[PDB]
Amino acid sequence: AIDFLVNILELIKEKQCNINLFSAISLTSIVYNNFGEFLSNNQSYSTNNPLLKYHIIILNDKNKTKDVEEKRNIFKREVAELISRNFKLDGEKVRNYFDSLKEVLKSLKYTIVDVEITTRTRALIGVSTSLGKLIFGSGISFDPYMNLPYIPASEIKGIVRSYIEGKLGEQEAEEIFGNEEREGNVNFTDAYPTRSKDFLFVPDVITPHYNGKKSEADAEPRPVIHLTIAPKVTFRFLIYYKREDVGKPICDSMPIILIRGLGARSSVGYSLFELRKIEVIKAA
């Protein structure tokens, strides 16, 4: 129904941790991409939608097309700030999930290594994923059932494995993580955010001027508003294994791999983390 559309922003503003952010962003992308038409007296004639402010504001009296373009850029920035402010973190479901999972794995006689890691700068994980991809052009690796961004276990294991290669040779790398003729001795889980000081997502921008440009006559900025993960957001994840002599490298690698990036565009200091905690719970 068009009513869910015209009320999705009120919904975001009023539920804020209990909407499905994935579907919410995907449905407000329809509003974003039909802006010029949702404004032609299709405000639902209510006074709660954030769309009503774009009927008062006059940005270009002379041409209504440029007018709507500017209003739409304002709307994009406004949506990013809306998601950032309203959608915040409750890590209680995540703490319950990880604790129950630790119990399950202890039953299965695994050697568990609970790891928490606080993001030091604004992070960017899964920037080519699909969350906002239809509004911002960027994404965030995001669980639509935990309703929370996360770090894929494949990605953590990949960074750890490349570090162990660089440090100990691909032979021992494969000896820990397996090759196409063996299997990995160490298992990883996704990393979900358990606690944050404040805002979960925060807006940012990138503005390529001379990327893909021949000369200074090509130069024109192209701003890209997008959402990133706020700093001081803690991500918990586990590592479990059976083979005991797999503990040494892993718990040795973890403190270091975090200093360097753990996400996207870390060559400009974005996705840096800090080892907040480790708990090895050996199987006896």
């Binding site: 579907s23 449905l27 059932y145 490349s162 397996g178 298992n187 990883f188």
Partner: protein, 190 residues
Amino acid sequence: RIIEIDSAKPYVWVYVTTYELLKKVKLYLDSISQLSNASFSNLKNKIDTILAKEGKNITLDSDLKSAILNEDFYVELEALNNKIPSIINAGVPLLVLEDSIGREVINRSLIRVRRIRIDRDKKVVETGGLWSEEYVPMKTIFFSVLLGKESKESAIFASCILRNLRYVILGGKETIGKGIVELRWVKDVI
């Protein structure tokens, strides 16, 4: 994934079924009640209490009237007073949909996590090293039957093994944390 309004409790996701899946579960139960001295009349009675409504979307435990499922499908529900509480323990609602609308919902209700492989030399993604995978969301419920033939070992099995069997690892991607599963034994769930 659901976007509901006009409803008191807020839900980020809901359980979804079709009548085709329920018919298949009922068929399983009927078959194995004929072929064995077993009859799970409680489960069967709940299932066909639901199946009575076949032909219209319903909600077992909620006040959902409208909703958008998987941001694509706008369904109008209408409740039923059955409230299967032991399979859906956490008070999540449970929508049972017309089989033509519910196929789409169920099929876009999976997760396609797209992975890559990094070229360690240049540290960019290898050429041709990029793929997708479907996972089924966590907390998904599958129904299955374990049958046994009269033997001395089958008793020992059904009494000791199948009573201490609670968690297993199903499928692949075990080292991504992608296999863990809990078995429920309707013998003590319904």
